RNA sequence: CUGGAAGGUUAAGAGGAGCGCUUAGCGUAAGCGAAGGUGCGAAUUGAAGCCCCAGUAAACGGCGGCCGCGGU
């Protein structure tokens, strides 16, 4: 989000759309079912890299 | 078009298992019936080709829809 960009584990409940967006379906196609091998930061920039 | 393995299909010719007609004989008749002649004739065998398989587009040819780069 332009103003509220963040990454964290959340307890909050979220309402999902009745139809999943294209990006969501793409992520599902490629990485749903997969395992997170590593999470790393690109130097000390605000960029997290998930190896899946 | 070129090449080709299995499997399938296919001519004449080859081959005659059988069958019909005829009748010496045999039978009171009805009918049976050798041999010969004669008229058909099944299995089996039978190439290329074709089906089939592979390649080949400066061979003949052909080079999409629909929906939201993705889906179908």
Kindly list the protein residues whose beta carbon lies within 7 Å of any strand B atom. A 22, 25-26, 29
Q: Please, which experimental method was used?
A: cryo-EM
Asked if residue A39 lies in contact with residue A18, where contact means CB atoms within 8 angstroms, the answer is: no
Q: Using the structure, give the distance in angstroms from the CA atom of A45 to the C1' atom of B45, rounded to a whole number.
A: 90
Q: Which residues of A5-18 are buried (b: 16+ CB within 10 A; e: fewer)?
A: eeeeeeeeeeeeee
Q: Which nucleotide is nearest to A22 (CA to C1')?
A: B70
Q: Using the structure, give the distance in angstroms from the CA atom of A36 to the C1' atom of B47, rounded to a whole number.
A: 71
Q: Using the structure, give the distance in angstroms from the CA atom of A48 to the C1' atom of B72, rounded to a whole number.
A: 35
What count of Cα atoms within 13 Å lies in the side-chain half-sphere of residue A20? 8
> Residue A27 CB: number of other CB atoms within 10 A?
13
Give the C-alpha separation, A44 to A52, whole Å.
21
């Amino acid at each position: 989000h332009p103003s509220y960009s963040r990454v964290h584990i959340t307890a909050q409940a979220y309402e999902n759309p009745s139809e999943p967006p294209m990006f969501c379906m793409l992520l599902r196609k490629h990485i749903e079912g997969g395992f997170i091998e590593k999470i790393e930061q690109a130097g000390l920039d605000r960029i997290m890299i998930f190896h899946i």
